[PDB]
Amino acid sequence: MKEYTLDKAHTDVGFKIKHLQISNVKGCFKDYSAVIDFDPASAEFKKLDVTIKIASVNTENQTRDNHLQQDDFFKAKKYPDMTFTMKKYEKIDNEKGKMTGTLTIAGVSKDIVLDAEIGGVAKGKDGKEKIGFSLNGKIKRSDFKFATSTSTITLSDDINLNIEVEANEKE
Amino acid sequence: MKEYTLDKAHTDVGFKIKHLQISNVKGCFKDYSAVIDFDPASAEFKKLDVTIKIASVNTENQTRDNHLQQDDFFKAKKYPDMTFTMKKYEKIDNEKGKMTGTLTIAGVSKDIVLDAEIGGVAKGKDGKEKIGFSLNGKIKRSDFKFATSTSTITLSDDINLNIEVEANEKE
Amino acid sequence: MKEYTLDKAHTDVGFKIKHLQISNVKGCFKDYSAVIDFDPASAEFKKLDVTIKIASVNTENQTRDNHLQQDDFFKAKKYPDMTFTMKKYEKIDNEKGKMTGTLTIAGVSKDIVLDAEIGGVAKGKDGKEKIGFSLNGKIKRSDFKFATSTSTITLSDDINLNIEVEANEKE
Amino acid sequence: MKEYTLDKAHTDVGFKIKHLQISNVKGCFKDYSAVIDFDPASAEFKKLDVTIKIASVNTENQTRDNHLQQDDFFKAKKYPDMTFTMKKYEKIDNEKGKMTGTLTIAGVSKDIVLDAEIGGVAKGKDGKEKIGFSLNGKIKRSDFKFATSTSTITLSDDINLNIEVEANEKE
Ligand SMILES: *Cc1c(C)c(=O)n2c(=O)c(C)c(C)n12
Ligand SMILES: *Cc1c(C)c(=O)n2c(=O)c(C)c(C)n12
Ligand SMILES: *Cc1c(C)c(=O)n2c(=O)c(C)c(C)n12
Numbered sequence: 001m002k003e004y005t006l007d008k009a010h011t012d013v014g015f016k017i018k019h020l021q022i023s024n025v026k027g028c029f030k031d032y033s034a035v036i037d038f039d040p041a042s043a044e045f046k047k048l049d050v051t052i053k054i055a056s057v058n059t060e061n062q063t064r065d066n067h068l069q070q071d072d073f074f075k076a077k078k079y080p081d082m083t084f085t086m087k088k089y090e091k092i093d094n095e096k097g098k099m100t101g102t103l104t105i106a107g108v109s110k111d112i113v114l115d116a117e118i119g120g121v122a123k124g125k126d127g128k129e130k131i132g133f134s135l136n137g138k139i140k141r142s143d144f145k146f147a148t149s150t151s152t153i154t155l156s157d158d159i160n161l162n163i164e165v166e167a168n169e170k171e
Numbered sequence: 172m173k174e175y176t177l178d179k180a181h182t183d184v185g186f187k188i189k190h191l192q193i194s195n196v197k198g199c200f201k202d203y204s205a206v207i208d209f210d211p212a213s214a215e216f217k218k219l220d221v222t223i224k225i226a227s228v229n230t231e232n233q234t235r236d237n238h239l240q241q242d243d244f245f246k247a248k249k250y251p252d253m254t255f256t257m258k259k260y261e262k263i264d265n266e267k268g269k270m271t272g273t274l275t276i277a278g279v280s281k282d283i284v285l286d287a288e289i290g291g292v293a294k295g296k297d298g299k300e301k302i303g304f305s306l307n308g309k310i311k312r313s314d315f316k317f318a319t320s321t322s323t324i325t326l327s328d329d330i331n332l333n334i335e336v337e338a339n340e341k342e
Numbered sequence: 343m344k345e346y347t348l349d350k351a352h353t354d355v356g357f358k359i360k361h362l363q364i365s366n367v368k369g370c371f372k373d374y375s376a377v378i379d380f381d382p383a384s385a386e387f388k389k390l391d392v393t394i395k396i397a398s399v400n401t402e403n404q405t406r407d408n409h410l411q412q413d414d415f416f417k418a419k420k421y422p423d424m425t426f427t428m429k430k431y432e433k434i435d436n437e438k439g440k441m442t443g444t445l446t447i448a449g450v451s452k453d454i455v456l457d458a459e460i461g462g463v464a465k466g467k468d469g470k471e472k473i474g475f476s477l478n479g480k481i482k483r484s485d486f487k488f489a490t491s492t493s494t495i496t497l498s499d500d501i502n503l504n505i506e507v508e509a510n511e512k513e
Numbered sequence: 514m515k516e517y518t519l520d521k522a523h524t525d526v527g528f529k530i531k532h533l534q535i536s537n538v539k540g541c542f543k544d545y546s547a548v549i550d551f552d553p554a555s556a557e558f559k560k561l562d563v564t565i566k567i568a569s570v571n572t573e574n575q576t577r578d579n580h581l582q583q584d585d586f587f588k589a590k591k592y593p594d595m596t597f598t599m600k601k602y603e604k605i606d607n608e609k610g611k612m613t614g615t616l617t618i619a620g621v622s623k624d625i626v627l628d629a630e631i632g633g634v635a636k637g638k639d640g641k642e643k644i645g646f647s648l649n650g651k652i653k654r655s656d657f658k659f660a661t662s663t664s665t666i667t668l669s670d671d672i673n674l675n676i677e678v679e680a681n682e683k684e
């Protein structure tokens with residue numbers, strides 16, 4: 001038997017423990033087109049049709065964006081774009097209204113409600129019109145059989161849509 | 172009715188989705204004492220007794236370290252230190268053995284097994300002894316009624332102990 | 343050395359593995375009062391005020407219901423009831439409208455929107471009025487600093503309100 | 514305007530909230546073979562070789578058992594059996610020892626340690642030998658690239674092996 005004294009400089013009293021953390025993935029699409037028909041006399045949308053190129057997704061991260069295009073997500077080879085088609089605008093007042101339309105994600109279609117909030121209807125620098133408005137609503141991955149392989153535990157069933165639009169008059 | 176064209180520079184087609192991520196919290200204790208009795212003729216530990224100052228915890232983060240000291244964790248005001256007491260060393264060979272001892276965390280005591288691996292028994296620069304060895308094992312938060320408020324979902328029930336020791340002879 | 347043959351009847355080749363499962367807690371309150379003012383000529387709510395006795399909660403389970411009353415939840419000793427007060431009814435059509443009001447849970451108050459759907463406005467068996475309607479909306483635990491100790495991982499931040507009402511005319 | 518009184522018998526003040534729950538999946542294999550060589554004079558295992566038919570899995574549930582056989586798990590069509598091969602038995606005392614061996618799951622092989630505990634070495638009713646012993650240890654899904662599609666969040670990375678054996682002498 002013999003007696004020792006730790007050399008504290010090269011000794012290490014250590015532990016490891018696993019925990020979970022919840023976080024929001026935020027992201028946009030860099031490339032989309034839309035058609036916007038709006039009557040400032042009555043503050044009613046007449047036609048709103050959007051097409052979004054799935055390929056142009058951006059969640060501030062290279063390898064996750066790529067991964068979004070694969071079979072377990074968007075299948076962008078087979079279904080290159082997602083689309084929104086307004087079917088009904090129900091006015092609340094001049095600042096607010098309830099938009100119903102058809103969303104299509106990878107060829108599956110469902111009718112959704114978005115909350116229209118008019119941010120401000122003006123006549124621009126040049127005397128030609130502008131508008132600023134937002135569309136907000138929650139959709140369920142499950143309603144579109146989207147990412148069915150990924151559990152509703154790992155990644156939430158709810159997707160929050162925030163569409164913020166500024167827009168100018170035509171011709 | 173009127174027609175508009177998005178100004179893409181001040182338009183934003185966006186989404187938010189919540190996901191979980193699993194991660195390891197790694198950490199040591201900066202301040203501890205020990206008593207080490209070891210026989211290099213037979214590669215057997217004779218006595219090993221450790222005291223660790225809960226206060227000296229370090230998980231590379233200021234606010235979590237503080238939080239560790241509160242009631243939902245260590246209760247460091249009432250129970251300032253955790254202790255380990257060897258009761259039995261069962262030799263496997265000269266490099267390996269099974270250590271049984273009493274761990275006490277916030278006044279609750281349980282007997283644990285650590286896996287002793289001898290990293291190397293030498294005579295130093297000056298002809299006085301050194302040893303290098305490690306102690307490894309898993310303990311359960313639940314066995315010590317530790318952090319009982321925190322679910323075994325958020326933070327894992329299993330804690331992995333890695334004690335890495337270098338140490339020199341005495342007097 | 344010697345050779346053996348398993349007795350398969352008293353041998354057992356076994357394993358244990360931990361998994362997570364997500365589930366909905368559904369529940370009502372058995373005891374509440376309300377005041378309901380409604381104009382069938384215009385299908386508009388005029389006043390809607392509800393008080394709910396936290397004590398009367400029922401989620402088909404004895405020990406969880408009790409647990410709901412404690413500090414980590416409702417604090418029913420100090421705050422025996424939750425209340426809803428309509429501030430605005432914005433009509434969509436005769437079947438649909440957007441209700442804004444003040445919800446108070448354990449003394450914290452926030453303004454919420456419920457989705458009013460009129461299930462049917464009739465004159466009853468006796469020639470005195472009836473109505474059937476529903477109120478639906480999502481509120482956030484976090485907006486009411488509710489159950490702050492419980493993580494948004496274990497128990498979801500979102501609570502879904504489904505109020506289904508049948509109701510008869512007065513005096 | 515008009516006044517109403519809830520009919521409480523057909524009114525319902527309700528809510529839904531999502532929570533997580535952790536649970537152990539326990540299970541065995543109904544069909545396996547083994548070869549057991551053991552020396553009661555020295556209480557040492559000499560050879561232990563096990564083959565388990567993946568097909569014979571039982572976790573008290575029909576549809577999960579089927580699901581275990583598919584690509585995201587066992588791939589039982591391609592890899593019908595898992596195997597264990599002892600390489601080393603290191604004796605602790607007569608009741609305890611450390612077993613090292615090769616586990617193969619769907620064609621991937623890793624060396625594991627099991628904790629041998631001898632439950633009792635006897636001579637049976639007829640004067641021919643019996644033994645009762647257990648093998649216990651934790652293996653990591655990740656070490657065997659097992660169920661790689663399933664996250665370590667949903668289903669734990671750690672699998673706990675409990676092998677309980679009774680066994681009689683040969684010829
Ligand atoms: C002791 C110590 C410090 C300072 C550190 O950063 N870490 C770790 O990451 C571990 C695992 C240990 C122990 N330590
Ligand atoms: C469009 C876009 C970019 C480039 C970005 O970083 N983020 C976000 O964080 C959100 C929520 C959105 C939309 N975008
Ligand atoms: C073998 C077996 C059966 C049939 C069963 O129900 N269970 C369990 O619950 C475990 C842990 C094991 C092994 N088995």
Ligand SMILES: *Cc1c(C)c(=O)n2c(=O)c(C)c(C)n12
Pocket residue numbers: 368369370371400402525526527528
């Ligand atoms: C009011 C009530 C009872 C008694 C019940 O079982 N449930 C549910 O499951 C819901 C969703 C509600 C409301 N209630």
